[PDB]
Enzyme design. Structure first.
Site, PDB file in Angstrom:
ATOM      1  N   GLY C  21     -12.842  25.247 -16.407  1.00  0.00           N
ATOM      2  CA  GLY C  21     -12.686  24.699 -14.851  1.00  0.00           C
ATOM      3  C   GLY C  21     -12.186  23.331 -14.863  1.00  0.00           C
ATOM      4  O   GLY C  21     -11.929  22.495 -14.110  1.00  0.00           O
ATOM      5  N   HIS C 135      -5.373   6.237 -20.288  1.00  0.00           N
ATOM      6  CA  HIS C 135      -6.565   5.936 -19.653  1.00  0.00           C
ATOM      7  C   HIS C 135      -7.633   5.506 -20.607  1.00  0.00           C
ATOM      8  O   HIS C 135      -8.655   4.844 -20.335  1.00  0.00           O
ATOM      9  CB  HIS C 135      -7.381   7.023 -18.807  1.00  0.00           C
ATOM     10  CG  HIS C 135      -6.526   6.975 -17.388  1.00  0.00           C
ATOM     11  ND1 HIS C 135      -5.883   6.104 -16.768  1.00  0.00           N
ATOM     12  CD2 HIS C 135      -6.312   8.319 -16.588  1.00  0.00           C
ATOM     13  CE1 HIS C 135      -5.163   6.578 -15.791  1.00  0.00           C
ATOM     14  NE2 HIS C 135      -5.424   7.826 -15.896  1.00  0.00           N
ATOM     15  N   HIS C 172      -1.606   8.188 -11.551  1.00  0.00           N
ATOM     16  CA  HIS C 172      -2.602   7.043 -11.735  1.00  0.00           C
ATOM     17  C   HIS C 172      -2.282   5.958 -12.513  1.00  0.00           C
ATOM     18  O   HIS C 172      -0.967   5.835 -13.030  1.00  0.00           O
ATOM     19  CB  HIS C 172      -3.451   7.780 -12.850  1.00  0.00           C
ATOM     20  CG  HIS C 172      -4.016   9.338 -12.445  1.00  0.00           C
ATOM     21  ND1 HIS C 172      -4.576   9.528 -11.370  1.00  0.00           N
ATOM     22  CD2 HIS C 172      -3.756  10.460 -13.336  1.00  0.00           C
ATOM     23  CE1 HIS C 172      -4.789  10.854 -11.435  1.00  0.00           C
ATOM     24  NE2 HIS C 172      -4.377  11.333 -12.495  1.00  0.00           N
ATOM     25  N   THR C 184      -0.779 -10.607 -23.179  1.00  0.00           N
ATOM     26  CA  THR C 184       0.540 -11.049 -23.998  1.00  0.00           C
ATOM     27  C   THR C 184       1.790 -10.970 -23.339  1.00  0.00           C
ATOM     28  O   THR C 184       2.015 -10.128 -22.483  1.00  0.00           O
ATOM     29  CB  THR C 184       0.352  -9.861 -24.951  1.00  0.00           C
ATOM     30  OG1 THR C 184       1.070 -10.236 -26.239  1.00  0.00           O
ATOM     31  CG2 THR C 184       0.919  -8.529 -24.455  1.00  0.00           C
ATOM     32  N   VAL C 187       4.602  -7.669 -24.205  1.00  0.00           N
ATOM     33  CA  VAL C 187       4.600  -6.154 -23.739  1.00  0.00           C
ATOM     34  C   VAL C 187       4.624  -6.646 -22.224  1.00  0.00           C
ATOM     35  O   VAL C 187       3.764  -7.405 -21.786  1.00  0.00           O
ATOM     36  CB  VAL C 187       3.290  -5.525 -23.949  1.00  0.00           C
ATOM     37  CG1 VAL C 187       3.198  -4.542 -23.063  1.00  0.00           C
ATOM     38  CG2 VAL C 187       3.124  -4.931 -25.579  1.00  0.00           C
ATOM     39  N   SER C 191       4.226  -0.385 -13.782  1.00  0.00           N
ATOM     40  CA  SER C 191       3.430   1.020 -13.346  1.00  0.00           C
ATOM     41  C   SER C 191       3.739   1.199 -11.794  1.00  0.00           C
ATOM     42  O   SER C 191       4.036   0.228 -11.039  1.00  0.00           O
ATOM     43  CB  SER C 191       1.968   0.562 -13.487  1.00  0.00           C
ATOM     44  OG  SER C 191       1.173   1.668 -13.180  1.00  0.00           O
ATOM     45  N   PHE C 192       3.661   2.426 -11.460  1.00  0.00           N
ATOM     46  CA  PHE C 192       3.832   3.042 -10.135  1.00  0.00           C
ATOM     47  C   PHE C 192       2.684   3.829 -10.044  1.00  0.00           C
ATOM     48  O   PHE C 192       2.683   4.911 -10.800  1.00  0.00           O
ATOM     49  CB  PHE C 192       5.032   3.781  -9.821  1.00  0.00           C
ATOM     50  CG  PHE C 192       6.431   2.584 -10.103  1.00  0.00           C
ATOM     51  CD1 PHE C 192       6.921   2.482 -11.467  1.00  0.00           C
ATOM     52  CD2 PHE C 192       6.940   2.324  -9.105  1.00  0.00           C
ATOM     53  CE1 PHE C 192       8.090   1.720 -11.633  1.00  0.00           C
ATOM     54  CE2 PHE C 192       8.119   1.468  -9.187  1.00  0.00           C
ATOM     55  CZ  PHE C 192       8.534   1.024 -10.548  1.00  0.00           C
ATOM     56  N   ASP C 258       1.844  14.587 -13.241  1.00  0.00           N
ATOM     57  CA  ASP C 258       0.809  14.465 -11.865  1.00  0.00           C
ATOM     58  C   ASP C 258       1.441  14.121 -10.665  1.00  0.00           C
ATOM     59  O   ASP C 258       0.628  14.209  -9.731  1.00  0.00           O
ATOM     60  CB  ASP C 258      -0.437  14.195 -12.342  1.00  0.00           C
ATOM     61  CG  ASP C 258      -0.589  12.861 -12.646  1.00  0.00           C
ATOM     62  OD1 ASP C 258       0.458  12.047 -12.410  1.00  0.00           O
ATOM     63  OD2 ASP C 258      -1.647  12.217 -13.415  1.00  0.00           O
ATOM     64  N   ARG C 264      -2.773  19.555  -8.617  1.00  0.00           N
ATOM     65  CA  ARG C 264      -4.208  19.790  -8.287  1.00  0.00           C
ATOM     66  C   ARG C 264      -4.915  18.483  -8.080  1.00  0.00           C
ATOM     67  O   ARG C 264      -5.561  18.549  -7.026  1.00  0.00           O
ATOM     68  CB  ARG C 264      -4.746  20.612  -9.575  1.00  0.00           C
ATOM     69  CG  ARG C 264      -6.169  20.897  -9.343  1.00  0.00           C
ATOM     70  CD  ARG C 264      -7.153  21.027 -10.902  1.00  0.00           C
ATOM     71  NE  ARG C 264      -8.363  21.590 -10.668  1.00  0.00           N
ATOM     72  CZ  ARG C 264      -8.457  22.899 -10.942  1.00  0.00           C
ATOM     73  NH1 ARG C 264      -7.397  23.757 -11.492  1.00  0.00           N
ATOM     74  NH2 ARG C 264      -9.561  23.703 -10.720  1.00  0.00           N
TER      75      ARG C 264
HETATM   76 CA   LIG Z   1       1.259   4.674 -12.560  1.00  0.00          CA
HETATM   77 CA   LIG Z   2       1.622  -7.717 -20.215  1.00  0.00          CA
HETATM   78 ZN   LIG Z   3      -2.619  10.200 -12.118  1.00  0.00          ZN
END
Ligand SMILES: [Ca+2]
Ligand SMILES: [Ca+2]
Ligand SMILES: [Zn+2]
Ligand SMILES: [Zn+2]
Ligand SMILES: [Zn+2]
Ligand SMILES: [Zn+2]
Ligand SMILES: [Zn+2]
Lengths: 163, 536, 368, 213
Positions: C21, C135, C172, C184, C187, C191-192, C258, C264
């Protein structure tokens, strides 16, 4: 019977709202603060024979910090803290290690718990006077001793360990 | 001086509320206690007066452990950081060491009934059902291949060293767990014994385990074939219906949103909105409209006319004379209001029922239009996809279902109109109607799901329009005023006839003094007509 | 023009079983390769077997205690590790299964070796679909991720690239990657992600870094039902401005699948073409790119998206008809490469986009 | 409801062989006394119950245990402190609670059938009602705000008490090192002080003068 207590809310807010735990060995453990109490207050009266009670009642606080801590003194978030303390240093002095912020909470609780003990009028008057003096001195130097700036936060591991 | 009093009175008139003014005064008072600087003061005053440029300009002329972010907080200074052995200079100088975020939530949370249709759950269940069987089958086949390879190897050296050969925990594979996992799955509790046997004496143990694994693989393969046969006609019955996220919700919200009271209150909310804005005295002209809509085709207008007439001609409770009256009202008067018989505008002062009819007609026209563009887009997409796929070399650039032909795709809309008609007769069951509509028009099919109810609502509006004397008086007054030329005309001549237009307004005020009256402006531009409705 | 790329696969990765599952299924990767094998994409692409990443390589970011626990944890000794099992957040959300450390080793080694080859200038494009686990934290496993191989890949790239940009298009928030590089300047994490009652609950608009790393971490919170057109209108300008101000030397693109329609646990409404438009936009800029996997929980859509963007990485056009393969019946009833979006409401209003994009632009203006 | 999982699992099977804690008033892992319906946490016992400590069999609470043992049995502050030590021993580990003197202290939505209420209340930024988008009401002032009209706009519903951008409390919340209580006292400094029209107008014209006095 407390004076200038709002500090507690800060404690509460950092300990169950801000999720910022207290230091394990912070400094000035409660028995040490009590002994500093006895030393400072014995240097007040010109001829304080009744010091035969001072240490006694100060000693009393230590033993009331012994059995009562952990049961109805800490919070749900503080439960893993006490669990780690009792699992790592059981033989070490239980009434030690913990800091001053916890101490005042006891005087917050006793004001209700004392309602379940029928002492005599003179004894209760003496005890009430002594706690009134105790929190008055704590009000005199709350800033010097209480400091919320050194309040670290709980990582998610502690979050899982708590609830 | 009095300028400050006027400023305070106008911020009073534009704030509408004592408490928010009170917050404003707390702001300026905290400023007055020398705790707020001028730049900071104008930064706190911005939320209050950020939408009135005159207010902000006049006010400006009058003036003349730690935590950052929202999810990151710091580690203790006296915290025993976990030691790491692989730290190079870049690791020390780049990696974060003081700030941490915490996952407030967890994945696979309560999302089963949050936003997914019930028919997506069936597809998901089928997907994990397939994944379980396929992963176990592929583990079995991988172990079969590895053991076949090791047997092929052992088949090639001398017999006197075959007994000297031994196998490790990987069982000849590149993983130490997968082969053992497959053997455990196959053999149950006696897995350690056979594993020890094949590790100690591979020569006499590999062939029999190969035989058992191959037999189980064949049996599992036939079971998988049957299971896949069952698995079909379940994706077919659920895929398109899972792609449609609004049908069940759209049905009820549309059967409610088309009532007369909903249409009335939609405009009443705008009326009280603009009345409150006028009470505020904000900079908005007292001639702006209340709602705007657009009709961008006349062919769809005649199509809608045909639909409503087609319904009304099959109605028993309406007589021949009233059928003729509705015919004249729809196929003659409505075009005339639309100027079907630039900068050309028509004014129509309408009652409640006319507004209900005409908004419903706008919704019908818009939905027919959306279906029409959807059909055109499908046609163009199919044509360009065929043209693209015809010229395609695939990898040289270093069963199924038969898609409908182009003719069917272009005849979709005539077929769609005939199907709506058949729904109007009731000769087709709504379930098959919905299924067919979805199968042609994918995720945009829900727009045409409740067409029949809308059409009968329009039919009731037309019958009530014929039945009530107020509507006939309204249309007769419109015709009489148009005969003079005051009602509607050229945009430039408006000022020539505006006063005359006002007279028409006056008559409306003395004809429905106890009823709501709407002003409708039909303005023609580049082949479209923008409708513009307000209350009075 | 046409350039030499890299593709990493260990054929054992799909056999790893997360649990009954469990939405996390490595199986997807396998059939991605199957599609790659049946679209004729192996002739123009070089496929390599990723060496298992040693524990010493993993300890470059994670604590030695964490790697010790991961190597010594098995389903058969659950009782002797429970306390540490609680301390390391391995459990209900991130279960321990057979060969967990081997799965982590393969996923990390693919990204590490791809970063190594990109560093050696032997190729300018490397793909690892088995990786992208973003993550994972320094000493904990979360979000179905046990070892943050993105962090290790970026650390390997930093040995020869002065500045690197990580882009995350998974629904996510890449909390592990941004947290590892929060303070730092070498880098930047773009993110979206969906925000609001959604995992991990981090990634606000105001999370812009710390200290020296201030303004070098930009997050875009979204609502439910973002579509291809909005994603295109807000990816190209943001990425263009990010690389105009930063001028990076290397790019790491997390292809979380995802964010596709019908996922899902996802909520977005993107399609395969809209998802791949991000890769086209990044590839138009001609810098060493490492494409990684990540999320993706509707297995068939994951396979379709990953094979399509793999073909896009090769500048190849594949027929929209899906060729017969070992997992063909997964892609029914249409058996078509691209997917159709759902009609779910796009709660992402245009003015909200304009305000978020303007705030991000002003935040980016402050870079030196 | 024809489930296909059971057939697969039976086909793949190896052969093998033949509601709240009484102490803290909160949920979680609870052990229930077999004499009274009260239940206690593993960390709500005297001493707290660890995983390896629970005996195999029936479990009994502390109050019932005291009752059972009682049935079976059937100016020196030294004496007061012995009384306190006994009372603290007798007490159960429920929680610590601050006094209630300190911890203590619809219309803008579509109708049941779905309808804009009348009279309407609108967004402060646009003066447009809930019809376009849901409206959020500040809990300190009845000013209604949109999601997208804020600066920066809100991504999701504020599940708790939302603090509107017009309330001045933002500038006091700017600090990140001050203790909570000072912030709360500053907030309450503006939660009672009202009706100050003459003084603020006087102060504002006093500041308005270009030449200082
Ligand atoms: Ca993201
Ligand atoms: Ca940074
Ligand atoms: Zn996600
Ligand atoms: Zn009991
Ligand atoms: Zn409890
Ligand atoms: Zn607004
Ligand atoms: Zn407010």
């Amino acid at each position: 019977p407390e004076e200038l207590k709002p500090w507690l809310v800060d404690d509460w807010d950092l300990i169950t709202r801000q999720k910022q735990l207290f230091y394990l060995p912070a400094k000035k453990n409660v028995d040490s603060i009590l002994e500093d109490y006895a030393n400072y207050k014995k240097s007040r009266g010109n001829t304080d024979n009744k010091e035969y009670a001072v240490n006694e009642v100060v000693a009393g606080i230590k033993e009331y910090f012994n059995v009562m801590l952990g049961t109805q003194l800490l919070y749900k978030f503080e439960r893993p803290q006490y669990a780690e303390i009792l699992a790592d240093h059981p033989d070490a002095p239980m009434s030690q290690v913990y800091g001053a912020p916890h101490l005042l909470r006891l005087f917050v609780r006793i004001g209700a718990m004392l309602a379940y003990t029928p002492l005599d009028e003179k004894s209760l008057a003496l005890l009430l006077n002594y706690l009134h003096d105790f929190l008055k001195y704590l009000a005199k130097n709350s800033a010097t001793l209480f400091s919320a700036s050194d309040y670290e936060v709980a990582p998610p591991e502690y979050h899982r360990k708590a609830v | 001086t009095l300028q400050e009093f006027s400023f305070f009175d106008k911020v009073r008139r534009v704030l509408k509320s004592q408490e928010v003014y009170e917050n404003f005064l707390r702001c300026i008072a905290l400023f007055n206690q020398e705790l707020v600087s001028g730049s900071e003061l104008l930064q706190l005053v911005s939320p209050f007066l950020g939408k009135f440029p005159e207010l902000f300009a006049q006010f400006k002329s009058f003036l003349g452990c730690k935590r950052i972010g929202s999810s990151y907080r710091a580690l203790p200074k006296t915290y025993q950081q976990p030691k790491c052995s692989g730290r190079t200079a870049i690791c020390k100088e780049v990696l974060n060491d003081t700030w941490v975020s915490f996952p407030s939530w967890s994945e696979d949370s309560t999302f089963v009934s949050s936003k997914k249709t019930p028919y997506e759950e069936q597809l998901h269940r089928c997907e994990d059902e397939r994944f379980e069987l396929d992963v176990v089958l592929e583990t079995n086949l991988a172990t079969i291949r590895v053991l076949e390879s090791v047997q092929k190897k052992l088949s090639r050296m001398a017999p006197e060293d075959q007994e000297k050969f031994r196998l490790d925990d990987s069982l000849g594979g590149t993983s130490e767990v997968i082969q053992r996992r497959a053997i455990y799955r196959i053999y149950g509790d006696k897995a350690p014994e056979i594993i020890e046997s094949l590790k100690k004496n591979p020569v006499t143990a590999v062939p029999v385990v190969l035989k058992r694994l191959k037999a189980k693989e064949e049996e599992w393969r036939e079971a998988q074939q049957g299971f896949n046969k069952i698995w079909r006609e379940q994706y077919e019955k659920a895929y398109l219906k899972s792609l449609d996220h609004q049908a069940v919700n759209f049905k009820q919200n549309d059967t409610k949103a088309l009532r007369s009271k909903s249409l009335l209150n939609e405009i009443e909310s705008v009326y009280d909105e603009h009345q409150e804005q006028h009470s505020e005295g904000r900079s908005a002209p007292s001639s702006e409209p209340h709602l705007i809509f657009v009709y961008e085709d006349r062919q769809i207008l005649e199509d809608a006319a045909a639909l409503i007439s087609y319904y009304v001609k099959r109605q028993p409770a309406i007589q021949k004379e009233d059928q003729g009256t509705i015919h004249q009202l729809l196929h003659q008067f409505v075009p005339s209001l639309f100027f079907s018989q630039d900068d050309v505008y028509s004014l129509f002062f309408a009652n409640n029922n006319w507004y209900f009819f005409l908004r419903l007609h706008q919704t019908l026209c818009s939905r027919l239009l959306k279906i029409y563009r959807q059909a055109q887009k499908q046609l163009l997409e199919y044509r360009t996809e065929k043209e693209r796929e015809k010229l395609l070399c695939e990898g040289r650039r270093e069963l199924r279902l038969k898609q409908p032909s182009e003719v069917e795709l272009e005849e979709y809309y005539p077929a769609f109109l005939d199907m709506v008609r058949s729904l109007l007769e009731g000769s087709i069951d709504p379930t098959q109607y919905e299924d067919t509509l979805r199968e042609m028009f994918t995720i945009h099919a829900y727009v045409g799901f409740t067409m029949d109810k809308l059409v009968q609502n329009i039919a009731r509006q037309l019958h009530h329009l014929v039945s009530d004397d107020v509507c006939l008086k309204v249309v007769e007054l419109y015709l009489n005023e148009k005969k003079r030329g005051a009602a509607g005309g050229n945009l430039s001549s408006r000022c020539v006839r505006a006063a005359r237009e006002t007279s028409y307004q006056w008559k409306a005020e003395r004809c429905m003094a106890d009823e709501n009256c709407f002003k409708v402006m039909f303005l023609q531009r580049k082949g479209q007509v923008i409708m513009t409705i307000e209350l009075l | 023009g046409k350039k030499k790329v890299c593709y990493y696969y260990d054929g054992d990765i799909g056999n790893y079983y997360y649990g009954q599952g469990h939405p996390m299924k490595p199986h997807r990767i396998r059939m991605t390769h199957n599609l790659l094998l049946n679209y004729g994409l192996y002739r123009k692409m070089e496929i390599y077997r990723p060496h298992k990443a040693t524990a010493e390589e993993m300890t470059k970011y994670h604590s030695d205690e964490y790697i010790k626990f991961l190597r010594s944890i098995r389903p058969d000794n659950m009782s002797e590790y429970s306390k540490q099992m609680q301390r390391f957040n391995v459990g209900e959300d991130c279960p321990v299964f057979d060969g967990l450390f081997e799965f982590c080793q393969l996923s990390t080694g693919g990204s590490v070796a791809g970063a190594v080859k990109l560093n050696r200038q032997q190729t300018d494009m490397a793909v690892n679909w088995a990786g992208g686990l973003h993550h994972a934290k320094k000493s904990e496993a979360s979000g179905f991720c046990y070892v943050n191989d993105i962090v290790l890949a970026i650390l390997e790239l930093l040995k020869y690239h002065q500045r690197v940009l990580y882009i995350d298009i998974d629904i996510h928030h890449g909390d592990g990657v941004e947290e590892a590089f929060y303070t730092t300047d070498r880098v930047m994490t773009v993110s979206f992600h969906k925000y609001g009652e959604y995992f991990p609950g981090t990634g606000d608009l105001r999370d812009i870094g710390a200290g020296k790393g201030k303004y070098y971490a930009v997050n875009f919170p979204m609502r439910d039902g973002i579509d291809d057109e909005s994603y295109g209108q807000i990816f190209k300008p943001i990425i263009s401005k990010v690389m105009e101000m930063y001028q990076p030397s290397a790019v790491v693109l997390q292809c979380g699948a995802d964010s596709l329609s019908g996922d899902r646990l996802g909520c977005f409404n993107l399609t395969v073409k809209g998802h791949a438009k991000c890769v086209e936009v990044v590839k138009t800029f001609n810098l060493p790119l490492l494409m990684l996997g990540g999320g993706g929980y509707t297995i068939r859509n994951v396979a379709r998206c990953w094979t399509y963007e793999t073909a896009v990485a090769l500048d190849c056009e594949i027929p929209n008809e899906l060729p017969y393969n070992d997992y063909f019946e997964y892609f029914g009833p249409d058996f078509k490469l691209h997917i159709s979006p759902s009609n779910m409401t796009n709660q992402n209003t245009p003015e909200y986009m304009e305000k978020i994009k303007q705030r991000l632009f002003e935040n980016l203006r402050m870079l030196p | 409801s024809g489930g296909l999982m059971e057939q697969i699992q039976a086909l793949l099977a190896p052969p093998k062989t033949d509601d709240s804690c009484d102490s803290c008033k909160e949920g979680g892992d609870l052990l229930c006394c077999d004499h009274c319906p009260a239940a206690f946490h593993l960390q709500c016992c005297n001493p707290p119950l660890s995983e390896e400590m629970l005996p195999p069999g029936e479990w009994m609470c502390h109050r019932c245990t005291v009752r059972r043992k009682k049935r079976e049995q059937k100016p020196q502050l030294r004496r007061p402190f012995e009384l306190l030590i006994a009372a603290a021993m007798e007490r159960n580990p429920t929680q610590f609670q601050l006094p209630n003197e300190l911890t203590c202290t619809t219309q803008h939505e579509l109708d049941h059938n779905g309808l804009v209420p009348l009279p309407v209340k609108v967004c402060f930024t646009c003066n447009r009602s809930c019809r376009v988008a849901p409206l959020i009401q500040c809990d300190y002032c009845p000013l209604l705000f949109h999601m997208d009209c804020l600066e920066p706009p809100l991504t999701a519903m504020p599940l708790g008490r939302w603090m509107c951008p017009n309330h001045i409390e933002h500038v006091v919340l700017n600090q990140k090192n001050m203790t909570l209580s000072n912030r709360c006292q500053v907030f309450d400094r503006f939660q009672d002080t009202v009706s100050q029209h003459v003084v603020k107008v006087d102060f504002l014209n006093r500041i308005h003068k270009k030449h200082p006095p």
